[model samples]
Target: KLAATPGMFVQHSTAAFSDRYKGQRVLGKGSFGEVILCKDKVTGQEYAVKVISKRLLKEVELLKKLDHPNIMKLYEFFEDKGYFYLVTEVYTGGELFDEIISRKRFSEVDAARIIRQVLSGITYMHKNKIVHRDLKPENLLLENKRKDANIRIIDFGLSTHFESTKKMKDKIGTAYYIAPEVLHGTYDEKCDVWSTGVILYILLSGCPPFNGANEFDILKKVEKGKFTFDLPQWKKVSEPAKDLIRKMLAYVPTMRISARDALEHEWLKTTSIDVPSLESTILNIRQFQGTQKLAAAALLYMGSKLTTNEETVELNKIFQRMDKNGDGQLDKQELMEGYVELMKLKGEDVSALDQSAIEFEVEQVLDAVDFDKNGFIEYSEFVTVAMDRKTLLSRQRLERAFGMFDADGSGKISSSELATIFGVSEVDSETWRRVLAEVDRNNDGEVDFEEFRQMLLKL
Candidate 1:
């Protein structure tokens, strides 16, 4: 009954037609939707406007609220003429798939760096109860600078929100990367992991682990899970890196390595050891600053080149707006309110919107964002929603830092506990030695709460 609701109509808004939202042209046309490059007239910043049919708006709305530094941001939505425009962040970059194709293939170190980010993002999403039905090279986009290039996850047309009671029945997503469970009509979030494994294999080996002349052939191979890696080529990659691929590509989803756990794997550990601080790393990669109107024109110009279709640009616009609270992830209430507001603008009675259906949808979204089952939405949950794979660890590290300060074990850290975490306590000689240097800020044998609190805050 809920699926029978009349689908929304979609149309494209142009710069000349709408003076309020204007900017450069970024993406053109492709399989999904038309994405245009535009700037916010009020903020003088650039954004990608994804124009989708009302039929697709329901799907787009869910995708917009996802948050990940590696994933593109969705800003807001508006309608002009007969079309609906979804605004998102316009990233000045290229797709990882394109980069891989151009380079033919990447070395072990290079491939691992990219794959780690991808895994981080996917793991976050999987934890949140979201499945990126589409996980492929074409859906992976990169920013302008390679060093700061975040391998972002995009496109959710075929993606559906998962709930505790609902099991996915319909088959969706691209063929090359589709998981075996999906082909069998019994799939879940792990399907995305399977596709991610396939992508990682390709990134490292310069070819997809499973391939056939047609979709049927590919599906057969995926079901059989009968692919082999060249021993000579496999020997070239580090043991840790190879192990990561094996864990991700495992035929059984139960055996697959989660994104959060993947970060702690030996391979990712080596990659992050020499990386810059999280704060500095994030600042270096982002191009836009404040609102859409305030972003630099040059950055907008570069973003235009990186975007290829209106759908991609529109998806980015929605991403920026959905992160309105700046907390990275959206709550169930936010998703409900945002989508209702958009539906109201379409001449649909806000009352006509199904409350139960909205609640169910919101529950699915909440499940996707609250990966840790802690009952509260964190930034990592947000990142997973967008399917961004690059910045999950940085966010996780921040969470871990916060956890360490909450020493009282009450599930919250007070300023008092914060002051004592780094302070010296009665312990064995080795433990005391480990903390004494940090606690003895004034070179005194004892440390006070003030000194300890300041040090913890600085971290």
Candidate 2:
């Protein structure tokens, strides 16, 4: 029988928020709660802590599995009697709205680049059946001050998972980006596509496609679903760019261009790709395939929690190339072909004799990395498999994860600690004891740092 991965369990520690992280300053405030800049007391790592008066399981669960470069990362979570603390990666570059304000408007190429990242994350989200009901400039943040900094999508408060058979009836979304169907009180994930189209329009023209004297007027204009590029901004923009926007902004949800198709659209492919051996990385994957369940989950947690864009640059390229369909997931066929192709680049003959053998090998790879067993490897799963374990399981990072689990600062994880970390009410004490015993090799009845580290790194 397979063990449960951490994703299925919504982990939360009952420890007071101040015990682990200290507030630095207020980032923003809202009626629900506020986001504040904070630092981990143990690791000195900065984070944006979203403190809310109430618990939002939908947002937390959705954020837990969303692991994409362009998506915001949720590092840790804490809840007490007073509030739910969501510790997330801090973005210093401010909102995309500010960037647009300072620069006036982006060039067609720049707009395409930004929209490409947004679409990439959207594709990943939609693949997981999630719709970010609220997509606006305020929710798009820059990672840093660098001119080429990456864009991240934040604020999943209004996001929800959807089923194709069921239409979402909530009149959700901001005035400018809200799709016409959303106004009609029935829509699907296509609403997010419409929002991105509005974002693209604004990026290229420095103004919303639908605007008016106030919010009411803006909503009416969005409800009408009519807009034009007749402004002087249209003169400089390329026809192809406008055409893509037109397809994205299609009033009928059925006519809207899917996020995956939009990713491969002619305009977004402004850049290019190339060849890499991936000898060690793929080798790491094979090693990862044999890893025990708990260790594999630890690796996955580290990969999603601590890995940076620069660290996964090589793997990112490999994933992009491997995902020939550009749906942000690698199917078994793609995995088999990618493995055969990688070996072929090494001058190895991938004849029919080994082709069948490669099938079994790729199956093992899928079994190891496909956490959901959905028969496709998600971006984060690919990154976890391809990540360098030595770097990923460094002493500092291991200690940070340990600090998170050791909520009581006892320097060891007791059964109760594990229970609290995994949310005690969700999983009973017996299961927590079993999980701890998996790592408590010395029969110490508790998991110390060494035991925890060994559990994650052991074969």
Q: State, as a TM-score between 0 and 1, how close model 1 is to the true structure.
A: 0.56
- Show where candidate 1 strays beyond 4 Å: 1-17, 26-28, 272-459
Q: For residues 234-265, what per-residue lDDT tens digits would candidate 1 score against the true structure?
A: 66777777787788778886787666666667
- How do all models score by TM-score? 0.56, 0.84
Q: Write the per-residue lDDT of candidate 2 for residues 313-382, one digit (tens) a residue.
A: 6677687667765666788898887777777777877563377787888888888788757777877778
Worst 10 residues of 2 by lDDT: 1-10
Off by over 4 Å in 2: 1-10, 53-55, 80-82, 270-279, 308-321, 340-357, 402-448, 451-459
Provide the clashing-pair count of each candidate structure: 49, 0
